[PDB]
Structure 1
């Protein structure tokens, strides 16, 4: 709870383990949070790294599609399909628009809708996990998929999600919790007023918990 105990989630919580000495292999810590919890559309992000610094952790197939040319916008990589003859029948509704825009990351496709997005395609998907975000959709979905694959930084969109990092095993305290904060930027604060907008969260590394608030 943004208090002294931050370094109790960090410093005092960095060698908890669950057995004997402390092992003999590398470490793996971070600092959990989110993306903005807005609705993955209107306003929740912009630009600027923390860091932070990471990438996947497990899988990365997100979202990118629109026309017959959006497939190759997911061929030399791996993404979801919006289909062509579906935006007039079933390419969006609940578990539909989901499918294409409901993965884990967010979305990195382009744009093309017309008079249909106030309760179907572009619509039903927003806070679900996608609704047309900033993925430099013009050359494709790879270069700006540096904001959708690796490096990172920590593009935090769709539904929660983000990253963190600072050191290895044991050598951080005030800058461990203050490294977790450092592992937060346009995700912990931003422009006009943004020093906080949530309730709680989690964190650790592999040991056991962090802040007991």
Structure 2
């Protein structure tokens, strides 16, 4: 891809689309990738994540699976703390867990609870795309969720097209372009061969 080209593309909307619509949103821009002739029914399916230290996400909805030494820090940070009793009542009710997954699409988990969940309620709802990344031994949750989030999973499905929504109008062109370029470079690296495999890529905004 060409830097000057993505420059007028971000210009085609960050200095035009918003003038055309002028609509009240927490505006986010998405770029979508479709590939020409690599059937997903075959082998070597790709699945990776991006380290994004910008997080144009910040309309956030996060859930935690924390053990002791986390209730107080979660309360101070304004995140609901979930423990063994709360988890066993989620174990009793099997639809409210899906409703709360909808409420908190994003999950984070600790070692003991990620080891304890696969008894019966793990695989039951595992068909939702909630893969919880285990926390490290640093146990310093300050901003660790910030790096854990905004990690887009380039997961290949039975449909041969996908999209990644990164970039808002609150932050500016240099870092939004840096984020999208690094996401594209990671996608090319994860793909089986050269960037020429990509047929068409759209950088147009939400409206």
- Alignment counterpart, residue 156 of structure 1, candidates 120, 130, 152: 152
As a proportion of its length, which structure holds more strand?
Answer: 2
Map 1:200-211 to 2 at 5 A: 203-204=204-205, 209=207
Residue 65 of structure 1 corresponds to 65
Distance in 2, matches of 1:80 and 1:186, equals 36
Segments of 5+ residues of structure 2 without an aligned counterpart are 33-45, 154-162
User: What RMSD over aligned residues (CA atoms) do the two structures have, in Å?
Assistant: 5.0
Distance in 2, matches of 1:200 and 1:98, equals 34
* Superposed displacement of residue 65, structure 1: 2.3
* Superposed displacement of residue 203, structure 1: 3.8
Residue 99 of structure 1 corresponds to 100
TM-score using structure 2 length: 0.52
- Residue 18 of structure 1 aligns to a residue in which SS? helix
Residue 79 of structure 1 corresponds to 79
CA gap of 1:100–1:71, structure 2 versus 1, over 3 A, is farther
Map 1:99-118 to 2 at 5 A: 99=100, 102-104=103-105, 106-113=106-113, 114=115, 116-117=117-118
Contact 1:70 1:109 in 2 (8 A): no
Contact 1:64 1:100 in 2 (8 A): no
Segments of 5+ residues of structure 1 without an aligned counterpart are 23-27, 35-42
Contact 1:148 1:155 in 2 (8 A): yes
Distance in 2, matches of 1:115 and 1:29, equals 39
TM-score using structure 1 length: 0.51
Higher relative contact order (CA 8 A, sep 6+): 2
Contact 1:80 1:100 in 2 (8 A): no
- Count the aligned residue pairs: 173
- Residue 108 of structure 1 aligns to a residue in which SS? strand
CA gap of 1:134–1:84, structure 2 versus 1, over 3 A, is closer
Map 1:17-56 to 2 at 5 A: 17-18=19-20, 31-33=29-31, 44-46=47-49, 48-49=51-52, 53-56=54-57
Contact 1:66 1:109 in 2 (8 A): yes
Distance in 1, matches of 2:70 and 2:98, equals 16
Distance in 1, matches of 2:102 and 2:67, equals 15
